[PDB]
Amino acid sequence: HGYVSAVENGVAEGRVTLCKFAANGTGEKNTHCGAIQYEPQSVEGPDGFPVTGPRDGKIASAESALAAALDEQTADRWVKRPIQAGPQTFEWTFTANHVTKDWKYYITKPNWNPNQPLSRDAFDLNPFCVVEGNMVQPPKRVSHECIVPEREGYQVILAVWDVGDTAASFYNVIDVKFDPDWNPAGQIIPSMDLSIGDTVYTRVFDNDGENPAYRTELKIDSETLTKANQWSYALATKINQTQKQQRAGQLNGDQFVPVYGTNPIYLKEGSGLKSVEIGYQIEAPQPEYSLTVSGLAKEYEIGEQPIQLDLTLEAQGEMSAELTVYNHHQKPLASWSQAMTDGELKSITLELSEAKAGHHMLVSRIKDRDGNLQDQQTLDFMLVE
Amino acid sequence: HGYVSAVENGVAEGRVTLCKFAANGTGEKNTHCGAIQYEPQSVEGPDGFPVTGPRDGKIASAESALAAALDEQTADRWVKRPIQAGPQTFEWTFTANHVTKDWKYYITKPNWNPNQPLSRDAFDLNPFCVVEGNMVQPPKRVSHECIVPEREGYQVILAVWDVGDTAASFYNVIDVKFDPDWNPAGQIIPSMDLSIGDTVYTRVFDNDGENPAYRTELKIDSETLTKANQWSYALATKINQTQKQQRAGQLNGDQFVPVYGTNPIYLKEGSGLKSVEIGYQIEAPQPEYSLTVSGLAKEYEIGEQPIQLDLTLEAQGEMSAELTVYNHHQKPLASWSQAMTDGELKSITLELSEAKAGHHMLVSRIKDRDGNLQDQQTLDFMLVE
């Protein structure tokens, strides 16, 4: 288990790595990577690439269910790390120890299409770098000296770690860009949808702090602008249309090009401008959410049987409800969660994993359809002899 | 804009900080923080705490919409960072320059309840540490020498950064646990739901590598076990139930207590065991999703009016669809996304923001009900004068 990293001498972090760790130097992360963001070390799949191995369109994820998001492929989806042709050092960090057959590195063909899913077709299937593992366990960090072929613009390098004792390999794709008076100073991340009537805007900082003369404002006045990727694109575009000392969008050649996704923000050298943050104004209404819990007694008497909470839940709003029972020692004795529709009544019974006299509590959490906590309520009850 | 960090001499990172950055030493992250994970610098709310400011239950989020997930409060929800009473150093990192009135630090009362929403009553409202800002802008990173009061177990520290020239403050709560032959070895992280028929299991490593004899496996054989927090609890519980050299759960006193959430894994010093990773065996092959796109022509002539794509879309499986048009230079010219039900037919029209002769692509991405990418397909088309 492990991943391509850059803590020692590595030229560039793996795609999956940047889901968990910030890029060296720039601080960027990849976004919306799904579950693999919590275990970048586990992009493991069937060995035998390219003859067998992960199938086309499932190379970046290695067919792992946790890493499905990595298989998306467009020109603007992923953070790209600077690189040059010739001698370069690639670095792996291992969280677990495996006997190793070898490591192989592949690179996209010059004619690869950055908007098609990665495939054998997209790569030169003759690896540009191979390092022998000698069927022994490697140390916890390794550095590989490779010769990176000549390329221009955006390319993808596929690092494959072939393990010796199992029918498995680890696959880490790497997004690189082959190598002025514009300084990065923040970015527009599309991380939350908006509602009509809302407004998203920049907060621009000069030498004296925030300065409203430099703000750019986008009113959310159409259903299309409610989508995060859409208002992001639009705010980035409006910055370019209306400002002299600010630009936004991904760097494509010498141009700043707003995309439907993340849009970095840049400030003009000599402008005196320091950075930009984003602010959100929501004139919007607060849907009301509510989960009425009924059926909890004041006391439960310990009998020959396991203690049971027979409860009724009434939902106001569309939600996910999560209930947990804790004894007084912070030990969880029962838990339950389910989606509930606006106006739904449900009858449930929670069985306590154990019954000792004392103060207990039921914690009920309400999350909206988009998954954020709207409310938490904690109800006290007692077990008695 | 800024957050409580541990890049230099800070004792413990802010809760929000750990949504983006891995913890010092352990590499632990807070999970499912929502949008604020992409901007930990932005937990800004009304000033005047505790007399005014964010209301009870919205202290951790500072009433910010990005940060609502932070208001959840249970004994096991958040990563707890070790601390001791007495002299300690707290650290802030700033992304943006604000004139500062002061920094204040509060700690929970010894009788606080870790399972109730954070409130003024949970805190000693006499701050244990105050540092004057003198109404000037601070350096991009500051270190504050404080004296932490005597406490045991889990406590919350609220750090408040009061900004001088606006009616706002930044609020960063910090989860701390006040201070033998059980070594930290890995983590069961509830990042994904499973299916009946699946199995989740441990992969235990000793000096010879993966050792199959030490494996613990859990069959998902009930509706209940499909939920991530549920199988996490169950696997940790089964480890404790069947292994002599391994423990799983959050440390509560001297005991390892499995929780419905993240369960750390420990190995007995001198057992020969080094670490533990998690593996997943998934049985159901399905489903297949498809979005068939009809009406894309080979060529389109420019053009007195903007060029328009008359498409018919057909959905297989419940999904959300995303379409994007890219020109040859990979500037996005149009974007669309919406949910579709299994078998739905939708006809739409996409208008290109510009019409120049050359090779174009229409990219579609299918996400399943859970948000997991299921397919990507791209069609080539050409614009001509």
Author numbering:
A (entry chain A), B (entry chain B): 24 to 202, 209 to 414
Quote from the publication.
Colonization of these different niches involves an N-acetylglucosamine binding protein (GbpA) that has been reported to mediate bacterial attachment to both marine chitin and mammalian intestinal mucin through an unknown molecular mechanism. Recent studies have suggested that Vibrio cholerae secretes a protein that mediates adhesion in aquatic environments, e.g. to plankton, as well as adhesion to human intestinal cells. This protein, GlcNAc binding protein A (GbpA) binds to N-acetylglucosamine (GlcNAc)- containing carbohydrates, such as chitin, and is secreted by the type 2 secretion system. We report structural studies that reveal that GbpA possesses an unusual, elongated, four-domain structure, with domains 1 and 4 showing structural homology to chitin binding domains. Finally, mouse virulence assays show that only the first three domains of GbpA are required for colonization. These results explain how GbpA provides structural/functional modular interactions between V. cholerae, intestinal epithelium and chitinous exoskeletons.
Although extensive efforts were made to crystallise full-length GbpA, GbpAD1–3 was the longest construct that could be crystallised. The GbpAD1–3 structure was solved by SAD phasing, and refined against 1.8 Å synchrotron diffraction data. The structure of GbpAD1–3 reveals three distinct domains rich in β-structure, linked by disordered loops. Domain 1 (GbpAD1) comprises a four-stranded and a three-stranded β-sheet forming a β-sandwich. Between β-strands 1 and 3, a 65-residue loop forms a pseudo-domain, which consists of short α-helices, a β-strand, and loops. There are also two disulphide bonds formed: one in the loop/helical region (Cys-42 and Cys-56) and one linking β-strands 4 and 5 (Cys-152 and Cys-169). A structural similarity search with the Dali server identified chitin binding protein 21 (CBP21) from S. marcescens, which is part of the CAZy Carbohydrate Binding Module family 33 (CBM33) as a structural homologue (RMSD = 0.9 Å for 168 Cαatoms, 47% sequence identity). Structural similarity searches with DALI revealed only distant structural similarities between domain 2 of GbpA and the β-domain of the flagellin protein p5 (Z = 4.0, RMSD = 2.9 Å for 68 Cα atoms). A more significant structural match was observed for domain 3 of GbpA. This domain has an immunoglobulin fold with significant structural similarity to over 200 structures in the PDB. The crystal structure of GbpAD1–3 lacks the C-terminal domain 4, comprising residues 415–485.
